[PDB]
Design a protein around this ligand. Structure first.
Ligand SMILES: Cc1cc2c3c(c1C)C(C)(C)CC=[N+]3c1c([nH]c(=O)[nH]c1=O)N2C[C@H](O)[C@H](O)[C@H](O)COP(=O)(O)O
Ligand SMILES: Cc1cc2c3c(c1C)C(C)(C)CC=[N+]3c1c([nH]c(=O)[nH]c1=O)N2C[C@H](O)[C@H](O)[C@H](O)COP(=O)(O)O
Ligand SMILES: [Mn+2]
Ligand SMILES: [Mn+2]
Ligand code: NA
Ligand code: NA
Lengths: 452, 452
């Protein structure tokens, strides 16, 4: 249950019968994403064997099911956030130095075609996206002053066969490395089709891996041995050796061009706007490369939840007794709604749980508290807790004029109202709140034919 | 797409591949319900071929999927509430008189064993239920003064081989017929394994079918020809001829015995308490009888929602422009949460929608309003509307000290607080609230191998 590269992942999923093979030709323009969309969240990913008759298949849906990600590393869905956090803790405490290797030993350096981005089966995802996007690509970039690596993930729109337009949010580390090159232009690699270890490194936030620190070793914790890197053709760039595809790239500051629209976590479109142009100097491919894309939605909600929930639980359970679990629900775009599950020990702690949760995760708009006997990850079950337990008069806590996330239109200019719901039963515990219960049953204990 | 009896239903489901056959022996005590519970809500019912080696199999889960009920009558899940209401309208306007038939022509009169309730595979459902229950049984009872029929559905607990304890809520028509016999004791039949038409007749509320009116003709609207009835052995009683099983029963007023606990719609237990004892005078069975039981949960939520939603929609759309649909959600126990979907035409109507909905359905605790582009029946999607569109400051409307449903512990003594959520986008419509969209795609148009 360790994985060197995406090949390992796909074979494991294929073997486990958690792969959906779409054998028919599909169009990279809208149709592919459309099919993905009908499967979003089920316990399998999707391999498109034939995209516009490309030799290169595309994989989508790797991140939309915690059960699937768990199966790849042998952990239950419920234990995955702790699993990942424990591994990031081990990296912080004893980092594994990368292994630099010779160009002709690096599987990704197998081929170097003349740069034609339109030869790649890059999907146009949502119906109003401003073009085809690579959105699963991990950017590795060296500090122009100190050579220290930074690993981030960023959406790149294809303009033409050799140009991308990239979105760099405010306070991103890639942003800061560009500021340094603009005191001299910034080279980097875009590594498409990486294993989850690289994905989690890329998505690890600033306060876990500061600017002056190399988060890529996080990936080493999810594979035997160290992360393999390789000198590019640049040579200011460093390439991920075990990537399916890797793009050597260069970008000048103060050189903007229209990119977007694209889907945001909110489920709304980004504004099309002038954002940095990046020019693709070279292309490297394994033999039998699969192109990896992410469908905006649960794939992103789970990326954020798996990395963020353990810290949040840690912060709330430290301030409040009897906390059991915290969910950054998919309904809330893995960012705007937290459900906190606790075992009450005294009246009043449920409200402290609301304060602690809102204080620990500034983007949150809603917090719901529920008891140990409610499934915090089932929105039906939280609705039920609201319907039978919430006191609308005393259990709704509203915070006005507070800081929040500006992408969410409930928070114009990073400013608005938050609300907590205390959907707990009354304490001390009373019979009138004791839930009915059906015997728990192993279905393998019986012969069951379900439809034919 | 018409059905004379339960046999018709089961064959149609079997043919349609919407039947789950559990072939292994299962225990009527807890185990059976436990298996049902793992399937609750999916697009199939469950036939248990072998319950404690009884010759009689049991059917469960007929009502937990509107898609399944729709498939039986050729209507989409979305059109089923209107379908049922239209048919009850036709019955109110032009009722079909019943067909009385000779004892030896009535399939249910095939056999009349010595009365042994413990020979029947009657499930003990929830782990703290006070015994085995028949809960899908339709009671037919004649007015002791006027002979006019009343059809209701009531939970009966088995005490011993010839005695049941029944729960009769306040203001039930069976209650009123008992008050009349107690001016002279009340006979009636308990008809188990009936088609949905009989179920909907039984569940049709007081204000649609008054005390002095015979609701059983409603069933005639869901079958070719009239409802077949037959003289019992009593002979103050009337039996449903096409039932799988029918129990001739007698009950004296002021003759109480401990019954319960049992699951209520809330998902909590009823208080065990002195409630009327009923004594089973005779038992009738088809050959090839199947015993029909209901799992407390979605089976009950859909019974209430399918009968109630059209009236509620009718009442709200009359007072407010742009109403499209109203859901009595399963999270709210088909009773405590209504989601109202509308197409906004002017600021302010969303709040009138909250007032109209609360006014039209007194049990409601929560109302949520959403726009045309949110799936009101998907709790994830309503959570999303809450996360991105609700203004917590101006969009939460709280009503205190109002009437509500006493079974819900948020409303002690039929008194408490209600709350409406206005999770609509801003009007006039703005780009920042336009949801991303993936192309709609027919999956039958492609070769897809899904796991193996
Ligand atoms: C998980 C994830 C994170 C995205 C992201 C996506 C995903 C799935 C996409 C691909 C679906 C859409 C695009 N994303 C962008 C993004 N940050 C950014 O500046 N621009 C982006 O366009 N991020 C966030 C960024 O990669 C993380 O916050 C890193 O932790 C930042 O790295 P750093 O701390 O080294 O700066
Ligand atoms: C759908 C449904 C309705 C139940 C019901 C259930 C279901 C599934 C069960 C079986 C799961 C639990 C028990 N139920 C009872 C009940 N009414 C009552 O007085 N006592 C009950 O125990 N009802 C409702 C009752 O039958 C309806 O209110 C009828 O409209 C009454 O007919 P009436 O208007 O002629 O009185
Ligand atoms: Mn960093
Ligand atoms: Mn009636
Ligand atoms: Na990072
Ligand atoms: Na009735």
């Amino acid at each position: 249950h360790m994985h060197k590269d995406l090949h390992s992942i796909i074979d494991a999923l294929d073997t486990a019968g958690r792969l959906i093979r779409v054998r028919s030709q599909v169009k990279a323009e809208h149709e592919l994403a459309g099919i993905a969309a009908k499967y979003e969240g089920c316990d399998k990913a999707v391999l498109f064997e034939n995209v516009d008759g490309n030799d290169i298949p595309v994989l989508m849906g790797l991140y939309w099911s915690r059960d699937l990600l768990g199966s790849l590393y042998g952990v239950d869905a419920v234990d995955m956030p702790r699993f990942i956090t424990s591994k990031i803790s081990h990296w912080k405490s004893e980092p594994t130095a990368h292994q630099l290797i010779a160009r002709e030993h690096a599987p990704v350096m197998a081929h170097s075609p003349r740069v034609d981005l339109l030869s790649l089966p890059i999907p146009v995802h949502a119906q109003k996206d401003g073009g085809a996007y690579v959105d699963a690509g991990v950017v590795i970039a060296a500090d122009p002053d100190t050579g220290v690596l930074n690993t981030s993930i960023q959406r790149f729109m294809v303009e033409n066969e050799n140009t991308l337009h990239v979105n760099i949010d405010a306070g991103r580390h890639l942003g800061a490395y560009l500021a340094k090159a603009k005191a001299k232009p910034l080279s980097f690699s875009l590594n498409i089709g990486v294993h989850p270890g690289v994905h989690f490194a890329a998505a690890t936030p600033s306060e876990v891996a500061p600017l002056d620190v190399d988060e890529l070793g996080i990936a080493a914790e999810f594979q035997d041995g160290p992360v393999r890197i390789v000198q590019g053709d640049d040579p200011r760039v460093t390439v991920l050796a075990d990537a399916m595809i890797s793009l050597e790239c260069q970008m000048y500051a103060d050189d903007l061009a229209d990119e977007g629209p694209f889907a945001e976590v909110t489920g709304y479109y980004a504004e099309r706007a002038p954002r940095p142009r990046v020019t693709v100097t070279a292309v490297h491919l394994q033999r039998n490369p699969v192109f990896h894309s992410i469908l905006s939605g649960q794939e992103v909600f789970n990326s954020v939840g798996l990395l963020g929930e353990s810290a949040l639980f840690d912060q709330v359970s430290k301030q409040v007794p009897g906390i059991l679990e915290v969910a950054l629900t998919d309904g809330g775009c893995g960012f705007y709604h937290a459900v906190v599950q606790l075992k009450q020990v005294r009246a009043g702690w449920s409200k402290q749980a609301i304060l602690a949760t809102f204080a620990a995760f500034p983007p949150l708009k809603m917090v719901t508290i529920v008891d140990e006997d409610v499934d915090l990850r089932n929105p039906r079950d939280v609705e039920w807790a609201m319907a039978t337990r919430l006191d609308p008069e005393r259990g709704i806590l509203r915070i006005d004029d507070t800081f929040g996330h500006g992408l969410n239109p409930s928070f114009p200019d990073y400013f608005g109202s938050k609300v907590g719901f205390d959907a707990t039963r009354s304490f001390p515990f009373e019979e009138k709140h004791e839930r009915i219960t059906y015997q728990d049953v192993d279905l393998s204990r019986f012969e069951i034919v379900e439809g034919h």
